[PDB]
């Protein structure tokens, strides 16, 4: 039933079946929220711990692409590993060639150029047999100031002022539309992100249920520690 | 192209590889191969499924193949796949000897062939080899050994095992009758004869329907020899005499 | 070219000259022969300037990738091994590099000498370049593991100064670096004429 | 040939030659390589012109016998 | 030039090597170990071209340790020596040849002590004693004169000291210190360095 | 080409008001031997470009074939775009540099003359990929024997008419016949103008031998 | 045999000011004892703030300039912005090292303005070894002009001399004078001097005749 | 030359081949790993005891290096391939880095290999889950678990294979800081967790122990039976405290 | 049916359904309009935003100094095609030192996009392009299709609800030729606005303009550079 069609067949509506199925697969992931302000970018992801014997510190849904770029992922994290490695290698290659830092848009474009590079026929061994099942939120600070980007397995990437990905991306985006404004500060962005995460998460928000990282002008990628998270969740 | 593909290396909804199970059914339809490990040696006892009055005499053995100076194997399943696998086994043994100037340990050879089998069961789109193998040999690390390999690529060491037709009954008989640590080659041969007699119930046991090979150490050398017709006839005669004595004493 | 590095109780002292020559012609007197690979790793230039710069920049890229992947800084031994394996693939093709990889890691101060021929040796004191013999003599006469920081600075400066005095391909200014547990610092950059005034005078 | 670098910058004695910087003009690049016999009906003997001596070509490049 | 020497007794192998790493006319290292521990009872001693020695020795070491990890037991010294010879011979005619001179010392639980000699051309020879380098010329005669197959480890150390004293007296190279190791049924034991201050 | 076998001697180029003129002798030399005395070393590329080459004649024939095929393809497209003399010069430079970088050079030095959009083009390409434009050109021995006279005239008179350019070219050809041992007294003169490319020949130069009595 | 290289002459000079950069070269192309042409400038405009000077083997110079132009266009497409002078210098270093075993016989000097608006000058060896300098002479007359720039711009071997910041007019006069001296003593330098002045208002070219002998 | 896409997305966003590989893992024998303060214990159930089989050849616990060892549940041959590749990677890392691997590094390598086999043409995903334990250079005990999809996590105690849900519930109810205070306590905890799904009372248990800077040690049946007898003694102690 | 899953399978009616599905993919994208005068070629694209907090997707891309394109359909396919075109233009400038003619680039695009429509396991490029260029033949407007067919157009519109834009372009094609730059851009903006519902109006956020001409390189006006072109546009006639 799943081999009736190739990986590169269009639907009668003009959509590739596999890309739509990967978009569906995204909605099973944990919710991630990115907010871009004039003071920086903040990323918040639900860890979604399954068992208390599990160590939440081993879950890495926020990663450091470079000193000025961070990535939040939702969907199939094992699929996001290779994309994150490609992003890191691209940033290092750009530094080697040009002695400068990549812009967030160029990194997102380089990662998105890998999305549709799948297919059975006319493919080298080791090529991708299917699209990726992850949505990436790229947040960073470059010469154009802090910027937030969203990428999906369709290969499309756009700039976002504030976006949510994952299972609760519909309710969170509606909440993001109300709370967000252009004059928002970084502290306000973090507080609103944590409030929306608490609203959408099944379990009670705490210092181990979530990840939170920030990138600011003049400061590297910074992942919040447990004491900082405890301080932020003190009053919400 | 996609329409004609059989997808031989895909999982089933229950986590099963159908081609491997079908190859194992093919194994179950093959002839009985028996292996017993003793203190002073290890033997193979295969059933001759190639029987006909117009068939010519076999060169060395129909189902028992020498792999190197210290190892021999017996095959159950598709014959030509068995030929391919035995050629590959000999190649692996010679490659190890070339690299290290020492005879290969038995488990390493079994592991190499099982790796080839697993590679066929995982990728390539080809059907798996429908052969199960019994391995006997001697090496400086573990002495006399007996191994069994599956078309899936799974192997394991044994003291006594059987593959092919009526293998479950033979396994039960060996479980009942094999004595760990007390077996001699003579008692092992008697047990092999009785197990072949009981399992091959449709055809009465004769020296022309079974092939027996033993592996012994003789003054620092490994001796792999196939029992002659008179020797197997004497073994069958002793088994029948013991059976008649038991019948009288009951 | 004269580059030297030695380990003592307060880290690794790295010193170098700054003269680049093309035949008998001085192309530049302001060459940065100490390569700041990372905030924790240093390298030296001796031989081909382009070769050393390119391959140590590749090493810097590799170390940054390693830190990103493993979430931990690479060690001095691992970085030197990476550079040696990188340069061994082009052995016999004409690359001329002699470099010292200096840093501080979990094992303490580290100092490895890596050349394009394939050598990779850990040691206490090293000297590379055409003027390395004079620097070796002076440093060995004045070296001790129990040196004070200012004494180590003076020893490195004096050794490089003597090497530039005796070597025709060494000159310019002496660049001094100190590798400490929390990264390296650029100590100074003193012109050879000022050192001549200080020492002879 | 003239693209040698780092040989003499690493060890005072040894087969390798070259400074820290690549410069063909400073490493015996021919520049305008002219035969001493150019412009002559006969070829000059080996060693006729001592190196470092003021020499005027007898003709342009390409007129070597 | 670097110096290796191996002496095999009834139940031990004694090996030694110079600790000098030299560039041009300068000794860059005074304590440089040339012995690679292949296994719990195998030592590989390698000299030759810069870079080639470490690359080849570490490749062989990793392969031997991989064998031990995969099979649960260790390679015998004979098998390890033959594997090393096969790899060196394969690399001899390839695009990446290794110019290395090797001494393999090992103890086998069944075969006993063993010492193997390999030149850069990858010809393997089993010897009761062997040496490598220019210092081999000055010490192989002493070894021939004084070695006996039943030599004890104390007398073996004395004979090695005699060879190193001859190296001090007659060799033109400065080889002041030597690392000494012994392999027996209990493994590899590091003996005191033989030095000439 | 490692060893050129049959070679051509100097090729001259000169710009005038209204077009360019190119001259080359009709001799292919096998070493010192004048073996092929009726070959053409000037080709018409298209209606606005002409080409003359020195050096290996087989390589010149190969380049002529390739360039002719390119022109045929571009005219097959029929979209109103045609290769300019500058475009041909650039393509030739790229091809020569690519051949030189593979250690398999095309042993030729070519002169490209053209007239497009009311401006003359004169281009030089050598076997190493060295290219430039100049109001006058001369390869081989003409670089020493013909170039000084053209440069002198252009320094006195920067702009020449067609008649003056042809007369100067004839004088340079006569000098080359006098002083070049690989030259011949049978040459062609090719002109490109607003009317197209016109190749004239064979032509001979009037020679004086009165210094033989001195 | 076959030589894939030739020396075509040409001297390239660059001086970096506080708010300006000057790149200058002669326009004579030669080979052996002959002159290919008297109008062949060695200065190429890369961006609105960067000018490169290439001397040496002329075919390599042409190929390298074309490759640099293509790479600048590729960067502008991929990054939606123009390359900076330092980025161009690093990219050129990588490009030159890409041919380490068959080098571009090119002497490269990059002159322009950095991100702070200050003049920047980068000198390159044929295999990509480069550093930032305040002034540099490259080509056939580099050995003649470098000590004079050291004396006059760097105020070296001079005492009781104030290190006055270098002005545009003084730098232009100095460049013209040093190229006049080079044309006097160097046989490959002459027939013109082309000067490119990189300021925040754009790039300005100027031509000065030299002797033709 | 076979380039068929085997693992593809379903309309609901599911990778059916990966789910079937996980189902194949669910049919394997139960493997239990528990992290302690100074020790790491791996316990694997034997599905059946043949009495005619050389037990040394069917061990489900193996060492990847001198500091890392793993257990598995699922397809034995795929596990053998994965173990061989992990051992080769450990040797390569010891070569290039001149340092022994960390548990996280080899776990990452194994997980990346599995993910590669879930997204490459002409092959099916591995049908094994792994429990990778070991000690880092600083001496910190580590326990990781991989799955056919290629995702890994760190754990204090975990169980894979058949009956893994009940064993994991038992570990959740029983894993305490005072239950791993001593090495014998950790061993008894692992044996008790295994006993919740296996029969024969410790006869069907293969138990391994790895200590700080010590080689991996396999308990003989005598030690396992002694521990089972001690566990029965503690059961009788609970009985006497009840009444 | 059984003929709509492979690009190598003809139907009994002499049609290939996968190509038509890719054409539907093109029809799914937002509308863009291309039109040219005697001296200029203009692309006006109606950008779309995923959400109120998301920036509008790029629709006009730089190819060369004389060529720009506007995309409609799969964005990754559009980026692949744009990279191929950029490489072709760079190769042309490297080999011949002249800009690549627009028609020859469009022919190359068609040749490249025809290959996947005839090989098993490949799929048609699910993007349609409007190409604006200027060369020796003047300004050009070109339209490419997933069917690998391309058209030379006086004006064209592709994307969702492009039929109204095409009708407006049909009406005003007679005067498109003699318009100046501002008039031509206003005509294109009116055609693009014809695709919008009544409650929606053209603003500086969802309008992107690309212009190339005789003395003007290809330039993209996106947010604040669009206001001069938007200024002067009358209200919707309804």
Curated annotation (Swiss-Prot), chain C:
Reaction equation(s) it catalyzes: Cleavage of peptide bonds with very broad specificity
GO cellular component: centrosome; cytosol; nucleoplasm; nucleus; proteasome core complex; proteasome core complex, beta-subunit complex
Active site: 1
Chief location bin: cytoplasm
Location(s), subcellular: Cytoplasm; Nucleus
Molecular-function GO term, any one: endopeptidase activity
Subunit text: The 26S proteasome consists of a 20S proteasome core and two 19S regulatory subunits. The 20S proteasome core is a barrel-shaped complex made of 28 subunits that are arranged in four stacked rings. The two outer rings are each formed by seven alpha subunits, and the two inner rings are formed by seven beta subunits. The proteolytic activity is exerted by three beta-subunits PSMB5, PSMB6 and PSMB7. Directly interacts with POMP. Interacts with ABCB1 and TAP1.
Role: Component of the 20S core proteasome complex involved in the proteolytic degradation of most intracellular proteins. This complex plays numerous essential roles within the cell by associating with different regulatory particles. Associated with two 19S regulatory particles, forms the 26S proteasome and thus participates in the ATP-dependent degradation of ubiquitinated proteins.
Name of the protein: Proteasome subunit beta type-5
Organism: Bos taurus
Full-sequence range covered: 60 to 260 of 263
From Swiss-Prot, chain D:
Modified residues (Asymmetric dimethylarginine): 31
PTM annotation (Omega-N-methylarginine): residues: 17, 43
Modified residues (Phosphoserine): 64
Subcellular location as annotated: Cytoplasm; Endoplasmic reticulum
Endpoints of the signal sequence: none
Disordered: annotated span: 33-65
Top-level lineage group: Eukaryota
Subunit structure: Monomer and homodimer. Interacts with FBXO7.
Stated family: Belongs to the proteasome inhibitor PI31 family.
Role, per record: Plays an important role in control of proteasome function. Inhibits the hydrolysis of protein and peptide substrates by the 20S proteasome. Also inhibits the activation of the proteasome by the proteasome regulatory proteins PA700 and PA28.
Protein name: Proteasome inhibitor PI31 subunit
Protein's gene: PSMF1
Entire-sequence positions represented here: 188 to 252 of 270
Curated annotation (Swiss-Prot), chain F:
Keyword 4Fe-4S: no
A GO cellular component entry from the record: cytosol
Entry's Gene Ontology BP terms: proteasome-mediated ubiquitin-dependent protein catabolic process
Subcellular localization, as worded in the UniProt entry: Cytoplasm; Nucleus
Coiled coil: none
Domain of life where this protein originates: Eukaryota
Modified residues (Phosphotyrosine): 57
Keywords for the protein's UniProt record, in alphabetical order: Acetylation, Cytoplasm, Nucleus, Phosphoprotein, Proteasome
Function as written in the Swiss-Prot or TrEMBL entry: Non-catalytic component of the 20S core proteasome complex involved in the proteolytic degradation of most intracellular proteins. This complex plays numerous essential roles within the cell by associating with different regulatory particles. Associated with two 19S regulatory particles, forms the 26S proteasome and thus participates in the ATP-dependent degradation of ubiquitinated proteins.
Similarity section: Belongs to the peptidase T1B family.
Complexes and interactors: The 26S proteasome consists of a 20S proteasome core and two 19S regulatory subunits. The 20S proteasome core is a barrel-shaped complex made of 28 subunits that are arranged in four stacked rings. The two outer rings are each formed by seven alpha subunits, and the two inner rings are formed by seven beta subunits. The proteolytic activity is exerted by three beta-subunits PSMB5, PSMB6 and PSMB7. Forms a ternary complex with SMAD1 and OAZ1 before PSMB4 is incorporated into the 20S proteasome. Interacts with PRPF19.
Protein name per UniProt: Proteasome subunit beta type-4
Residues of the full protein shown: 46 to 259 of 264
Swiss-Prot record, chain G:
GO CC term (a single one): proteasome core complex, beta-subunit complex
PROSITE patterns the record matches: PROTEASOME_BETA_1, PROTEASOME_BETA_2
Alphabetized SUPFAM superfamilies for the sequence: N-terminal nucleophile aminohydrolases (Ntn hydrolases) (SSF56235)
Keywords tagged on the record: Acetylation, Cytoplasm, Glycoprotein, Nucleus, Phosphoprotein, Proteasome
Keyword 4Fe-4S appears in the UniProt entry: no
Residues recorded as bearing N6-acetyllysine in the entry: 176
The keyword Disulfide bond appears for this protein: no
A single GO BP: proteolysis involved in protein catabolic process
Record-linked Gene3D superfamilies: Glutamine Phosphoribosylpyrophosphate, subunit 1, domain 1
Phosphoserine carried by residues: 34, 40, 134
Domain of life of the native organism: Eukaryota
Positions bearing carbohydrate: 30, 181
Phosphotyrosine modification, residue list: 122
UniProt function note: Non-catalytic component of the 20S core proteasome complex involved in the proteolytic degradation of most intracellular proteins. This complex plays numerous essential roles within the cell by associating with different regulatory particles. Associated with two 19S regulatory particles, forms the 26S proteasome and thus participates in the ATP-dependent degradation of ubiquitinated proteins.
Family: Belongs to the peptidase T1B family.
Subunit structure: The 26S proteasome consists of a 20S proteasome core and two 19S regulatory subunits. The 20S proteasome core is a barrel-shaped complex made of 28 subunits that are arranged in four stacked rings. The two outer rings are each formed by seven alpha subunits, and the two inner rings are formed by seven beta subunits. The proteolytic activity is exerted by three beta-subunits PSMB5, PSMB6 and PSMB7. Interacts with SERPINB2. Interacts with RFPL4A.
């Amino acid at each position: 039933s799943e081999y009736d069609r190739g990986v590169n067949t269009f639907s009668p509506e003009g959509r590739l079946f596999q890309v739509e199925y990967a978009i569906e697969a995204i909605k099973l992931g944990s919710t991630a929220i990115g907010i871009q302000t004039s003071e920086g970018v903040c990323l918040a992801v639900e860890k979604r711990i399954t068992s208390p014997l599990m160590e939440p510190s081993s879950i890495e849904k926020i990663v450091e692409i470079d000193a000025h770029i961070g990535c939040a992922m939702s969907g199939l994290i094992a699929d996001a590993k290779t994309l994150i490695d490609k992003a890191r290698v691209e940033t290092q290659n750009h530094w080697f060639t040009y002695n400068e830092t990549m812009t967030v848009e160029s990194v997102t474009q380089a990662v998105s150029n890998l999305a549709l590079q799948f297919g059975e026929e006319d493919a080298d061994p080791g090529a991708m047999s299917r699209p990726f099942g992850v949505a990436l939120l790229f947040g960073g600070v470059d010469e154009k100031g802090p910027q937030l980007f969203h990428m999906d397995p369709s290969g499309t990437f756009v700039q976002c002022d504030a976006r949510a990905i994952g299972s609760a991306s519909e309710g969170a985006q509606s909440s993001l539309q109300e709370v967000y404004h252009k004059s928002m500060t970084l502290k306000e962005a973090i507080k609103s992100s944590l409030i929306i995460l608490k609203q959408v998460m099944e379990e009670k928000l705490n210092a181990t249920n979530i990840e939170l990282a920030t990138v600011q002008p003049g400061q590297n990628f910074h992942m919040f520690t447990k004491e900082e998270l405890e301080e932020v969740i003190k009053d919400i | 192209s996609r329409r004609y593909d059989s997808r031989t290396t895909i999982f089933s909804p229950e986590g099963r590889l159908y081609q491997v199970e079908y190859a194992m059914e093919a194994i179950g339809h093959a002839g009985t191969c028996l292996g017993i490990l003793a203190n002073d040696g290890v033997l193979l006892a295969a059933e001759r499924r190639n029987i006909h009055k117009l068939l010519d005499e076999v060169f060395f053995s129909e189902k028992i193949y020498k792999l190197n100076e210290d190892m021999a194997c017996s095959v159950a399943g598709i014959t030509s796949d068995a030929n391919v696998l035995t050629n590959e086994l000999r190649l692996i043994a010679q490659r190890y000897l070339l690299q290290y100037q020492e005879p290969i340990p038995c488990e390493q050879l079994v592991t190499a062939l099982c790796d080839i089998k697993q590679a066929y069961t995982q990728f390539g789109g080809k059907r798996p080899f429908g052969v199960s193998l019994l391995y006997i040999g001697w090496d400086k690390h573990y002495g006399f050994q007996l191994y069994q390999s599956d078309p899936s690529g799974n192997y394991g060491g044994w003291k006594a095992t059987c593959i092919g037709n009526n293998s479950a009954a033979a396994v039960s008989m060996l479980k009942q009758d094999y004595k760990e640590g007390e077996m001699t080659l003579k008692s092992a041969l008697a047990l092999a004869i009785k197990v072949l007699n009981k399992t091959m119930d449709v055809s009465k046991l004769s020296a022309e329907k079974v092939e027996i090979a033993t592996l012994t150490r003789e003054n620092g050398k490994t001796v792999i020899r196939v029992l002659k017709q008179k020797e197997v006839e004497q073994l069958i005669k002793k088994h029948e005499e013991e059976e008649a004595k038991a019948e009288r004493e009951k | 070219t004269t580059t030297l590095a030695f380990k003592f109780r307060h880290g690794v002292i790295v010193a170098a000259d700054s003269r680049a020559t093309a035949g008998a012609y001085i192309a530049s007197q302001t060459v940065k022969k100490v390569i700041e690979i990372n905030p924790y790793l240093l390298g030296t230039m001796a031989g081909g300037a382009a070769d050393c710069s390119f391959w140590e920049r590749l090493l810097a890229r590799q170390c940054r990738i390693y830190e990103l992947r493993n979430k931990e800084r690479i060690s001095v031994a691992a970085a030197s091994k990476l550079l040696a394996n990188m340069v061994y693939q082009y052995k016999g093709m004409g690359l001329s590099m002699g470099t010292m990889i200096c840093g501080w890691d979990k094992r303490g101060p580290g100092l490895y000498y890596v050349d394009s021929e394939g050598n990779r040796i850990s040691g206490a004191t090293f000297s590379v370049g055409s003027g390395s013999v004079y620097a070796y003599g002076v440093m060995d006469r004045g070296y001790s593991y129990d040196l004070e920081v200012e004494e180590a600075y003076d020893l490195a400066r004096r050794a490089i100064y003597q090497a530039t005095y005796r070597d025709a391909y060494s000159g310019g200014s002496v660049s001094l670096y100190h590798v400490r547990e929390d990264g390296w610092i650029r100590v100074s950059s003193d012109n050879v004429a000022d050192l001549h005034d200080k020492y002879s005078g | 040939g003239p693209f040698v670098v780092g040989g003499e910058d690493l060890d005072p004695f040894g087969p390798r030659r070259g400074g820290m910087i690549v410069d063909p003009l400073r490493s015996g690049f021919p520049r305008a390589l002219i035969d001493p016999s150019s412009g002559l009906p006969n070829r000059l003997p080996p060693g006729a012109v001592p190196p470092g001596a003021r020499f005027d070509p007898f003709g342009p490049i390409g007129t070597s016998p | 030039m670097e110096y290796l020497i191996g002496i095999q007794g009834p139940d031990y192998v004694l090996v030694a090597s110079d600790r000098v790493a030299a560039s041009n006319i300068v000794q860059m290292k005074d304590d440089h170990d040339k012995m690679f521990k292949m296994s719990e009872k195998i030592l590989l001693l390698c000299v030759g071209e810069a870079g080639d020695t470490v690359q080849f020795a570490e490749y062989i070491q990793k392969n031997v340790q991989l064998y031990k990890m995969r099979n649960g037991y260790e390679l015998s010294p004979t098998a390890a020596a033959n594997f090393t010879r096969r790899n060196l011979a394969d690399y001899l005619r390839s695009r990446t040849p290794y110019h290395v001179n090797l001494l393999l010392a090992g103890y086998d639980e069944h075969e006993g002590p063993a010492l193997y000699y390999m030149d850069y051309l990858a010809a393997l020879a089993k010897a009761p004693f062997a040496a490598h380098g220019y210092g081999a010329f000055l010490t192989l005669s002493i070894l021939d004169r004084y070695y006996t197959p039943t030599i004890s480890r104390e007398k073996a150390v004395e004979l090695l000291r005699k060879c190193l004293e001859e190296l001090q007296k007659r060799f033109i190279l400065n080889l002041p210190t030597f690392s000494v190791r012994i392999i027996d049924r209990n493994g590899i034991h590091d003996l005191d360095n033989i030095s000439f201050p | 080409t490692q060893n050129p076998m049959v070679t051509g001697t100097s090729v001259l180029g000169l710009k005038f008001e209204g077009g360019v003129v190119i001259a080359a002798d009709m001799l292919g030399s096998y070493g010192s031997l004048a073996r092929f005395r009726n070959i053409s070393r000037i080709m018409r590329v298209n209606n606005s470009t002409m080409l003359g080459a020195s050096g290996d004649y087989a390589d010149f024939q190969y380049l002529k074939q390739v360039l002719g095929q390119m022109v045929i393809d571009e005219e097959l497209l029929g979209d109103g775009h045609s290769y300019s003399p500058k475009a041909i010069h650039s393509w030739l430079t790229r091809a020569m540099y690519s051949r030189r970088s593979k250690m398999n050079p095309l042993w030729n030095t070519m002169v490209i003359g053209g007239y497009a959009d009311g401006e003359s083009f004169l281009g030089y390409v050598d076997m190493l990929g060295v290219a430039y434009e100049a109001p006058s050109l001369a390869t081989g021995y003409g670089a020493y024997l013909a170039q000084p006279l053209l440069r002198e005239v252009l320094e006195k008179q920067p702009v020449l008419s067609q008649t003056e350019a042809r007369e100067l070219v004839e004088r340079c050809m006569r000098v080359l016949y006098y002083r070049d041992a690989r030259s011949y007294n049978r040459f062609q003169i090719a002109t490109v103008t607003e009317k197209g490319v016109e190749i004239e020949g064979p032509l001979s130069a009037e020679t004086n031998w009165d210094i033989a009595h001195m | 045999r076959f030589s894939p290289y030739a020396f075509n002459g040409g001297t390239v000079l660059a001086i970096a000011g506080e708010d300006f950069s000057i790149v200058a070269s002669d326009t004579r192309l030669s080979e052996g004892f002959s002159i290919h042409t008297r109008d062949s400038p060695k200065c190429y405009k890369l961006t609105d703030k960067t000018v490169i000077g290439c001397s040496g083997f002329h075919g390599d110079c042409l190929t390298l300039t074309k490759i640099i132009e293509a790479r600048l266009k590729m960067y502008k497409h991929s990054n939606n912005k123009a390359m900076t002078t330092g980025a161009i210098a690093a990219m050129l270093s990588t490009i030159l090292y890409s041919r380490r075993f068959f080098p571009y016989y090119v002497y490269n000097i990059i002159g322009g303005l950095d991100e702070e608006g200050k003049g920047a000058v980068y000198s390159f060896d044929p295999v990509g070894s480069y550093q930032r300098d305040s002034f540099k002479a490259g080509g056939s007359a580099s050995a003649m002009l470098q000590p004079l720039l050291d004396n006059q711009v760097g105020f070296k071997n001079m005492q009781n001399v104030e290190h006055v910041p270098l002005s545009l007019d003084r730098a232009m006069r100095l460049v013209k004078d040093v190229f006049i001296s080079a044309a006097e003593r160097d046989v490959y330098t002459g027939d013109a001097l082309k000067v490119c002045i990189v300021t925040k208002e754009g790039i300005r070219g100027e031509t000065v005749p030299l002797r033709k002998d | 030359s076979y380039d068929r896409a085997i693992t593809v997305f379903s309309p609901d966003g599911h990778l059916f081949q990966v789910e079937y590989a996980q189902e194949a893992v669910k049919k394997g024998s139960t493997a239990v790993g528990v992290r302690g303060k100074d020790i790491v214990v791996l316990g694997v159930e034997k599905k059946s005891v043949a009495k005619l089989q050389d037990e040394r050849t069917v061990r489900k616990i193996c060492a990847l290096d001198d500091n890392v060892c793993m257990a598995f549940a699922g397809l034995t041959a795929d596990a053998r391939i994965v173990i061989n590749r992990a051992r080769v990677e450990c040797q390569s890392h010891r070569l290039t880095v001149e340092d022994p691997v960390t548990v996280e590094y080899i776990t990452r390598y194994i997980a990346s290999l599995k993910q590669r086999y879930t997204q490459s043409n002409g092959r099916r995903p591995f049908g094994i889950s792994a429990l990778i334990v070991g000690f880092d250079f600083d001496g910190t005990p580590r326990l990781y678990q991989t799955d056919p999809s290629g995702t890994y996590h760190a754990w204090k105690a975990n169980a894979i294979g058949r009956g893994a849900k009940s064993v994991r519930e038992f570990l959740e109810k029983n894993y305490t800081d005072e239950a791993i205070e001593t090495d014998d306590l950790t061993i008894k905890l692992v044996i008790k967790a295994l006993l919740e799904v296996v029969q024969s009372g410790g006869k069907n248990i293969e138990l391994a122990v790895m200590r700080r800077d010590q080689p991996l040690k396999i308990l003989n049946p005598e030690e396992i039976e002694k521990y089972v007898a001690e566990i029965e003694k503690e059961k009788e102690e609970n009985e006497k405290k009840k009444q | 049916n059984q003929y709509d899953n492979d690009v190598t399978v003809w139907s009994p009616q002499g049609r290939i359904h996968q190509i038509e599905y890719a054409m539907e993919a093109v029809k799914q994208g937002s509308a863009t309009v291309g039109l040219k005068s005697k001296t200029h070629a203009v692309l006006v694209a109606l950008k779309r935003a995923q959400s109120e907090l998301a920036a509008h997707q790029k629709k006009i891309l730089h190819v060369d100094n004389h060529i720009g394109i506007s995309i409609a359909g799969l964005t990754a396919d559009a980026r692949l095609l744009c990279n191929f075109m950029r490489q072709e233009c760079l190769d042309s400038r490297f080999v011949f030192d002249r800009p690549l003619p627009v028609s020859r680039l469009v022919s190359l695009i068609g040749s490249k996009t025809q290959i996947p429509t005839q090989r098993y396991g490949r799929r048609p490029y699910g993007v349609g392009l409007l190409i604006a260029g200027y060369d020796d033949m003047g300004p050009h407007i070109f339209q490419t299709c997933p069917s690998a067919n391309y058209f030379d157009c006086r004006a064209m519109s592709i994307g969702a609800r492009s039929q109204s834009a095409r009708t407006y372009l049909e009406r005003h094609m007679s005067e498109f030729m003699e318009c100046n730059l501002n008039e031509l851009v206003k005509h294109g903006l009116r055609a693009l606005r014809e695709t919008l519902p009544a409650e929606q109006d053209l603003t500086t956020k969802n309008v992107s303009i690309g212009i190339v001409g005789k003395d003007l390189e290809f330039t993209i006006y996106d947010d604040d550079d669009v206001s001069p072109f938007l200024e002067g546009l009358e209200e919707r006639p309804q």
